[PDB]
UniProtKB/Swiss-Prot annotation, chains A, B:
Role: The pyruvate dehydrogenase complex catalyzes the overall conversion of pyruvate to acetyl-CoA and CO(2). It contains multiple copies of three enzymatic components: pyruvate dehydrogenase (E1), dihydrolipoamide acetyltransferase (E2) and lipoamide dehydrogenase (E3).
Organism lineage string: Bacteria, Pseudomonadati, Pseudomonadota, Gammaproteobacteria, Pseudomonadales
Protein name: Dihydrolipoyllysine-residue acetyltransferase component of pyruvate dehydrogenase complex
Parent-record interval covered: 396 to 638 of 638
GO MF annotation list: dihydrolipoyllysine-residue acetyltransferase activity; lipoic acid binding
Presence of keyword Acyltransferase: yes
Length: 243, 243
């Protein structure tokens, strides 16, 4: 792969060399290994979370009595675990012989935490088996452990899918990079009030933007549009997870 | 216990003797044994199921694709299993030494089916672990088995709590009898549109009437009002079961 010509950057003005933490360099290498290895496609969709938000906000009492803050993330984690069980090609990996996929029978999901030294993706194990407030607490713990360099590498391992949420900073949608050997990563952005046709007039609904990137070798376009559609359906009525 | 004086009933008109099935006589004896043994109290409450009904009705597609009809019963079964876990004195029994309660760590719930030969109460085991459509199917199976005399006695055993639903025939509330050695039975009646104060005006909400009878020896009045209140809360937003 042809390298970039070196440029003498100080010919154009003052420069200064800051160095990279080992975590950024590790990060850097893994992403470039994902990028050259995975033919990426991104599927955009946005979900109606007007009702999910109201749920979230009404349960602020309960959540505080349990010491967890309830955010959208445990609600995202729960719906994607249901779905990763319904559509198992998403919960799997290409075997190194290129000719089989390892379907994992377990659901562990990581999520991106951006710390000072770099990106960490702590994994929550068997997300399918935990409740909203369990997930809430654990997510929170692992994030502080991650910020405070106290996350032992055991916890960065063997995830089946990654969620990257930037809803807290902003943006309309992005195209995340798959953490190979996983096969898909959900990027989530800022929710906004949007007019939505109700058959007669435009209603304001709160809409969460979602960006699913996938490994096109394993997941085709119709499988991915069916996954973000189902996910949009589950987030608009989380009670469907009950049945 | 003093017996009833025999009356010669044919002195007043024509009589006719029809006999009792063994099932009615069994039924009869068990209820009288419950009645003389359990000091009963009934707690009335009614729950707002306007949203639960809409859920139920929107998922008619899914339910039919799975072959189960979704009724209010699997939704009742699920909420009472959550609750029987939260308030364990309800899921327990008085030890025969009268001085201890056996807390059961399992949740199996029966429900009354009134057949031609008598009342049968098939039990669904580990209701806490089944989903709405699993529960839907099983309930349905056991009921037909019950009508068709094909329910083997194994299935009438070791329930922790009974639901008796008469919502399908009518009535405003009733006072069911506890199936000793269980300690509580939920009776459910016909839902009706009722005006409910919203702080400013009366809104029509669909209200399900509930009648919890309990064994006052084991459950006190405040524990039972807290159980139907929590149950009313869970049926008004079944998503609380998720957290």
């Amino acid at each position: 792969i042809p390298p970039i010509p070196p440029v003498d950057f100080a010919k154009y003005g003052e420069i200064e060399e800051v160095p990279m933490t080992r975590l950024m360099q590790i990060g850097a290498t893994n992403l470039h290994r994902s990028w050259l290895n995975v033919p990426h496609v991104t599927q955009f969709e946005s979900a109606d979370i007007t009702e999910l938000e109201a749920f979230r906000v009404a349960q602020k009492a309960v959540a505080k009595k349990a010491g967890v803050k309830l955010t959208v993330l445990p609600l995202l984690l729960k719906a994607c675990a249901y779905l990763l069980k319904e559509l198992p090609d998403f919960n799997s990996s290409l075997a190194p012989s290129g000719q089989a996929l390892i379907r994992k029978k377990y659901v562990h999901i990581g999520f991106a935490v951006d710390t000072p030294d770099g990106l960490l993706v702590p994994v929550i194990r068997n997300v399918d088996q935990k409740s909203l407030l369990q997930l809430a607490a654990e997510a929170a713990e692992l994030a502080e452990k991650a910020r405070s360099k106290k996350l032992g590498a055991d916890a960065m391992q063997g995830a089946c899918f990654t969620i990257s949420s930037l809803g807290h900073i902003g943006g309309t949608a992005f195209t995340p990079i798959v953490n190979a050997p996983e096969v898909a990563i959900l990027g989530v952005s800022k929710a906004s009030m949007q007019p939505v046709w109700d058959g007669k007039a435009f209603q304001p609904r709160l809409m969460l933007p979602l960006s699913l990137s996938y490994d096109h070798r394993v997941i085709n376009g119709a499988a991915a549009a069916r996954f973000t559609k189902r996910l949009g359906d589950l987030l608009a009525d989380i009670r469907a997870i009950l049945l």
